[PDB]
Design a protein around this ligand. Structure first.
Ligand code: NAP
Ligand code: Q27
Length: 157
């Protein structure tokens, strides 16, 4: 299975200055629960943003840099390399990866951040005409998690 994993806001913002525009611990927990034991494929910028591979899953980085050889990270140099990765593969970002993959993936696990943030990077437009809502779950709010959010699982019709 090949899936997208993304958090985007009401206007599809995903990032600002190479980081998330929001602080939302529960989204990171969501990411952990979905991708632990599986494979993440991410662009080079997203990798440098996190700074180190995420534990307990396969971290795959897409880059043109032939000198890229980082401990605990597997490197690929082509989109086509993605299709040879075994198991459940999550396209993990960022904008460039999402743009390249949205037409190719089986499904998407989206965290809709129900606010409007300043962004410099965006998830591409998509329409519910193309995507069945397999589930929609409101995130729970508290002192640490104060931005309303909804976890959507969309499956291509
Ligand atoms: N909210 C979210 O769900 C989420 C998730 C992840 C990231 N983000 C945000 O997304 C933003 C980063 O997105 P971005 O588009 O600027 O960067 P990115 O997608 O993370 O990385 C871009 C880099 O990926 C490599 N790449 C992509 N396609 C390639 C291909 N076909 N062949 C070889 N290399 C390829 C290139 O690396 P080289 O230049 O090294 O060749 C490219 O410069 C940040 O603001 C970050 O915080 C948001
Ligand atoms: C690019 C900045 O995003 C950060 C920064 C630090 C993180 C630390 C732990 C887990 C995820 C992190 C994320 C992060 C959060 C994400 N959240 C969702 N819903 N989807 C993705 N595809 C994500 C991808 C990344 C990389």
């Amino acid at each position: 299975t090949l899936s997208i994993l993304v958090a985007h806001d009401l206007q599809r913002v995903i990032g600002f200055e190479n980081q998330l525009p929001w602080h939302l611990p529960n989204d990171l927990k969501h990411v952990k629960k979905l991708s632990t034991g599986h494979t993440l494929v991410m662009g080079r910028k997203t990798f440098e943003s996190i700074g180190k591979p995420l534990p307990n899953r396969r971290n795959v980085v897409l880059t043109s840099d032939t000198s890229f050889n980082v401990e605990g990270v597997d490197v690929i140099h082509s989109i086509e390399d993605i299709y040879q990765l075994p198991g459940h593969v999550f396209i993990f970002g960022g904008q460039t990866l999402f743009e390249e993959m949205i037409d190719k993936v089986d499904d998407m696990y989206i965290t809709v951040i129900e606010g409007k943030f300043r962004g410099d990077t965006f998830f591409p437009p998509y329409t519910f005409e193309d995507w069945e809502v397999a589930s929609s779950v409101e995130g729970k709010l508290d002192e640490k998690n104060t931005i309303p959010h909804t976890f959507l699982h969309l499956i291509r019709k």
